[PDB]
Point group: C3
Chain length 205, copies 3
């Protein structure tokens, strides 16, 4: 099966299986392993790998999409001695996650979000982009081939294509999404399409 | 099955199945979905995802290759009201495509060509490279990790490794492929190898 | 089967099947083809593609890991006339390889090592990184999105995130890994985790 439990390890005494909303579509050629929660109307495309086998949950919110070849994974959140590694855990609305993906988020083809990381609602993570040890705000756009490592990206900012942002001083001065910006409406269109694709693919299974 | 029809959606009243030349080899661990035409002697490697589920055809020409982890997908070409979105359609030799890949084209490992896009004959798209909203000419080389977004790349030019080209002014001044250039003969070698691999893998199926 | 022989071609008269240590774990959604040797306690994750179909062996040493979406492949090492192409072969400890990955090496998610290439022991190849026509020394760190093309990386150096190194003059002046460097202990942690994951996943098969 392509939806599987995680294994017993010294930081994982009890295997967990994914919790998947009945309205989500998981492609047969995707892989979803371990302590993962997937929300309503989510589309998970071929060759995506969502792997939660190092402690703590990976959460994917409602009406989000995980496109072809995307990888979600996380650094260890609990060491062998049972002690939580707080640097590798993100907090969102009072709860702890290894990776938190909000609602109406698009993770476009071949992107990767590696824990610890959080991605806020209505954000487009572009093709081949990379997020690691970062919190990306709501209503952001990461253009194709951009990256955020070790930073907080404020709400409503974008990262231009190819830019690798590794310092908070850079992140603070990123440009703002405006109506005339080329990707200002991209995420809403992609979410609309993917919610409809999920329903159509479900009707073929 | 890994060769599948696309689903019924508001922009796709009628499902389409891929049209695949009998001399092409599609690896069992590749995914090919929807309105796709694959030409003669094409090799599609493990973990490639060719997904035509947003309207209009993805075409892969004769003697081309689609290597491991490559993704082909496209933006919507027909909106819900049946109206064609002309910005997201490319025209090649009088016909309309979401993605057009010409003859003798190599799409090397982990690259991505996202529609609207066209790639001309005898072009090497290097490892991890990215093409989106662009027309790449014939006899071009995109070196590994290069990208073309929103531009036309003239025939016989190359993009150096790691360069992300987003303006036409940049694209117009790209260097020319010459006989002494390091990748000048790369595509011909890769095409020769892949046509022979396709035949060898077909003999094991 | 996802563990397969390579095909008969003009440079490969005799098919070879992978040689895999009984303590290694190969995920069912990985692909391993051809003349490949995998060492003890190696973890190969979903969507990895290890493909040795152009002559010469791809070797993955003991306690190494090949994470999700990683690709290993190599340029042709033997031409049609049976003549070895020496430029495309690396030598390590008196033996010839297309790709050599040493012991305790982490190939992180979506990275790629393309032959000819060698990666020395205790090296971290970061997420989305790229190695081609290069020898990477022991105890190195390639940060996420870095690349080494056509160069030798001395022992104990790192490449900062996003940097594409294509000249030996650049490679010679790369910074050194020190105890206070952010990724100085990353590889040891990742190797420890992956050796334990391999054993846990083996207990579920
Ligand atoms: Zn990871
Ligand atoms: Zn797409
Ligand atoms: Zn290759």
């Amino acid at each position: 099966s392509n939806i599987r439990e995680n294994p017993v390890t010294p930081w994982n005494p009890e295997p967990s299986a994914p919790v998947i909303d009945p309205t989500a579509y998981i492609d047969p050629q995707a892989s979803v392993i371990g302590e993962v929660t997937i929300g309503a109307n989510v589309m998970v495309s071929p060759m995506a790998s969502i792997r939660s086998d190092e402690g703590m949950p990976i959460f994917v919110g409602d009406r989000s999409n995980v496109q072809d070849g995307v990888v979600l994974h996380a650094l260890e959140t609990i060491n062998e001695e049972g002690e939580p590694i707080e640097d590798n855990i993100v907090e969102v609305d009072g709860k702890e996650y290894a990776v938190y993906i909000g609602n109406n988020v698009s993770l476009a083809h071949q992107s990767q979000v590696h824990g610890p990381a959080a991605v806020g609602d209505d954000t487009f993570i572009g093709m081949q982009a990379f997020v690691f040890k970062s919190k990306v705000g709501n209503n952001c756009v990461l253009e194709p081939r951009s990256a955020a490592i070790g930073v907080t990206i404020p709400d409503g900012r974008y990262i231009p294509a190819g830019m690798v942002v590794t310092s908070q001083a850079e992140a603070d001065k990123l440009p703002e999404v405006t109506d005339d910006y080329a990707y200002s409406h991209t995420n809403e269109a992609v979410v609309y399409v993917n919610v409809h694709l999920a329903e159509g693919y479900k009707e073929t299974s």
